[PDB]
Amino acid sequence: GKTVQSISVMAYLAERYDIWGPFLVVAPASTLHNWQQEVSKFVPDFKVLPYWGTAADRKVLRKFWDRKHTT
DNA sequence: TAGGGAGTAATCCCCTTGGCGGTTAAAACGCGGGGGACAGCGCGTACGTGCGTTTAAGCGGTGCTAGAGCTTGCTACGACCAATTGAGCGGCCTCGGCACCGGGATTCTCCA
Ligand SMILES: Nc1ncnc2c1ncn2[C@@H]1O[C@H](COP(=O)(O)OP(=O)(O)O)[C@@H](O)[C@H]1O
Numbered sequence: 001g002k003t004v005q006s007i008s009v010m011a012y013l014a015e016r017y018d019i020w021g022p023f024l025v026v027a028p029a030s031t032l033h034n035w036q037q038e039v040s041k042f043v044p045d046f047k048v049l050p051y052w053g054t055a056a057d058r059k060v061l062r063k064f065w066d067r068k069h070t071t
Numbered sequence: 072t073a074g075g076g077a078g079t080a081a082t083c084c085c086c087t088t089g090g091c092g093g094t095t096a097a098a099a100c101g102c103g104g105g106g107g108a109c110a111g112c113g114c115g116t117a118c119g120t121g122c123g124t125t126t127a128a129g130c131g132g133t134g135c136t137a138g139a140g141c142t143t144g145c146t147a148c149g150a151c152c153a154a155t156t157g158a159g160c161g162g163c164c165t166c167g168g169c170a171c172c173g174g175g176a177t178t179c180t181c182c183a
């Protein structure tokens with residue numbers, strides 16, 4: 001499980017350094033809904049942005065990008 | 072000898088076309104009547120034809136000088152490019168202009 005090891009890094013950055021992102025996961029498109037479920041399973045506290053869709057749906061999702069906070 | 076171009080097919084985002092459903096507003100259909108199209112008529116005046124006059128346009132001829140058209144010389148200036156930045160484009164935001172509605176007031180029509 002390379003997925004769950006990597007997620008446990010972000011959970012360590014959260015648990016140890018209070019870094020709750022922003023965290024970017026890039027994956028192949030067939031992986032997206034899978035990894036979304038995987039991160040939801042392994043770490044329920046991470047709010048996940050499922051950034052895919054037609055242009056208008058992504059344009060709505062960009063409203064969630066906070067540029068003010070680096071952590 | 073190697074690099075990057077040619078071939079090709081899978082991958083995945085963008086976007087234009089087409090269908091479904093309603094519903095609703097605009098196109099289609101009817102018909103009376105009116106008034107405007109249009110033919111037919113009278114007159115008169117205004118425009119084409121003709122003749123004598125004149126006027127000046129057009130052709131042949133002379134003389135002049137301006138200025139179009141060309142050659143020469145040079146330097147000013149705009150093409151050129153490498154370095155620098157700030158004006159202006161693309162994305163995001165919000166509030167106020169304007170439209171759309173409703174109902175009461177003034178205008179305009181048309182028949183008496
Ligand atoms: N520590 C674990 N506990 C339970 N299941 C795990 C653990 N680590 C991995 N898995 C399971 O392994 C399966 C495949 O793991 P995954 O990380 O998706 O493989 P990959 O390395 O190809 O990403 C997933 O279904 C995941 O749930």
Ligand SMILES: [Mg+2]
Nearest residue numbers: 001002003031
């Ligand atoms: Mg994986």
